Each structure stands twice: as C-alpha cells, then as structure tokens.
Design an enzyme around this catalytic site. Sequence first.
Site, PDB file in Angstrom:
ATOM      1  CG  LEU A 129      -1.883  -1.114   1.320  1.00  0.00           C
ATOM      2  CD1 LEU A 129      -2.493  -1.140   2.729  1.00  0.00           C
ATOM      3  CD2 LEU A 129      -2.981  -1.018   0.216  1.00  0.00           C
ATOM      4  CD  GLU A 130      -1.755   5.565  -2.772  1.00  0.00           C
ATOM      5  OE1 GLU A 130      -1.109   6.532  -3.233  1.00  0.00           O
ATOM      6  OE2 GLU A 130      -2.828   5.103  -3.315  1.00  0.00           O
ATOM      7  CD  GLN A 131       4.735   8.050   2.587  1.00  0.00           C
ATOM      8  OE1 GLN A 131       4.226   9.099   2.978  1.00  0.00           O
ATOM      9  NE2 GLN A 131       6.043   7.912   2.400  1.00  0.00           N
ATOM     10  CB  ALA A 132      -2.405   8.273   1.593  1.00  0.00           C
ATOM     11  CB  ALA A 133      -3.496   3.074   0.787  1.00  0.00           C
TER      12      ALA A 133
END
Length: 317
Positions: A129-133
Amino acid sequence: PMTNPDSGVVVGYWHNWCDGGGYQGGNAPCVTLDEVNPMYNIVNVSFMKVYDVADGRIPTFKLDPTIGLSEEQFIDQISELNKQGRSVLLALGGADAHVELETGDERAFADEIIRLTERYGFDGLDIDLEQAAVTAANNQTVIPDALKLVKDHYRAEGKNFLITMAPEFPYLTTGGKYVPYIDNLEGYYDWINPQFYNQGGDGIWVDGVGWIAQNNDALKEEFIYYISDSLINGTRGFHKIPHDKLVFGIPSSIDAAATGFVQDPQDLYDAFETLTTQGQPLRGVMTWSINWDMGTNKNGQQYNEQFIKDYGPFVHG
C-alpha cells in the site's frame, strides 16, 4: 500449483506498465516475465488496484497490453517461472490505487484474489500500500481478514498461498500504524519485506552508537544491522518480525527511490554477516524494482542488472 521458495529469496517487483520516469530522470521499460533474471526467485506483479472507482471498491488486476503479452502468453510465462521453482505474487497497492476497502468487503475481496489466483497462477500476494492507504477506510482490518480467508481456502487444498508485506520501515514501531497488518496476520504471513528507503531523514537511535539515518551513506552498514537487529528481536521500540521472516528491501538504483540506495553492497554483506554471526540470518533481499534494474539513467546508461548481480549470488550462495 502454488510454488514456494525453499530457502533465501531475492524479491523483485515487476511493473505492469511501460517507461516509468525515475527519481533522477532515468527510464524503466516494461519487460516480459521471461526476460527477468532467474535470480529474482520471487517476482511481484505490480499492481492489483482499483482501476476505475465506478467499478466498486474491490481491487483487481488488468494486464497492460502495451507490454506485448497476450493473456495466454502472460499465463504461460508464469507457468514457466513456476517450473523453474520461482514464485509470482500479485502486489496490492502502489500509487493512486484507490484501495479504500470497507468493513463487509472482505469476503468479496477474498473471492477476487482467489479468482485471479486461479486464472493467472499467482503464488500469493504482497501488501504494498501507498503511505496514505495504510490507514485509509477499513484497510487495516479488511485486507488481513480477506487474506486469512484466502490462506485458509488454499490450506484446505493442501497449498500455501504466500502472504508478504512491504511496510515503510518507520511504521513498524510497537505503536506504529502498520502493526494491525502484522498482528492480524500472525501465523498467516510468510515474510515481511519492509521498504528501508524513501524515508529521508528517518532512521534509528542506538544507545551507545548514536543517530543512524536512512539517508546516511557513511553509516549504511550500521543502519542495516541495527534496524534489522531491532526488528528481529522486537527491541528499540520496534515490533518483532522473526529473522527467518524478514527480507531487507532496498532500491535497485538512485532512479528507483529518492533515498535509501545502498552505495556499497559490501555494507549490506557485512551487516548480514553480523546478523548471521549472532545466529539471526535474514531471509534475503527485496528491491524496487526489476524494471529499474533493467532500465537506463538520465544519460542513457544501462543499469545492466547491477542490483541482481550484486545481491543474487550473495543471497543464493
């Protein structure tokens, strides 16, 4: 037909797109699966994602036709990797993936992972996952819940569906945002390959040694050693990951990540040696990415598989 590794791993990500631009202006071409150096014995197809929010919250995978592989050729090349003993995982997430799963989605998400696994021959799934996810919506609970369903589905057929995870390393603290993925999948995951890169001035304080930043090239050996020693013993404020389940993720070059590239591989070999000498050898290495390792820099020079040449023979020998 679910291929697992017998010992050390070099994990490499494989781009489902062509000609990515790099942090230093290089280019990452698409490549076929059959072009991947066999020393990458775990290959992570990137990314399972939501392509269009109009199709709902469940992530899926759609092969990019500009790579030049038909569906059948892609499926066949996975089968051929499996015949070589190599695994092909589906990597969930990446940038702009719109993964925002909600409580109740976990059964349908598990169904779709199983459907793609049956269709393509994937050997497991990497949470990337990307940071925000990482804390978006109910991702911290739905994603582990869905993967437990998948794991147990295949366990009932006598198969081990691989589950791996690529947390950014600062989030692995005892109270860190990544803890639920690890706790909720305890006994389900096969290894964790954290990203020890892209965190600039983050790092670890080691009493008696000092401040060891992830972007400090003079202390790279000490960084690799102490961040690993902390993880594999659950010390210095980090959540424990057993050493046989820890894979050290680093960039394939300065184009693949803004920071964290290991200038001198000897720093990694020596850190791994210290960990081995104390009886806690790590499981292997991971890198973003195969396509970067097969790419070019801003002046057109080939990276020429320098990463897999540096770490493949080291891990597999």
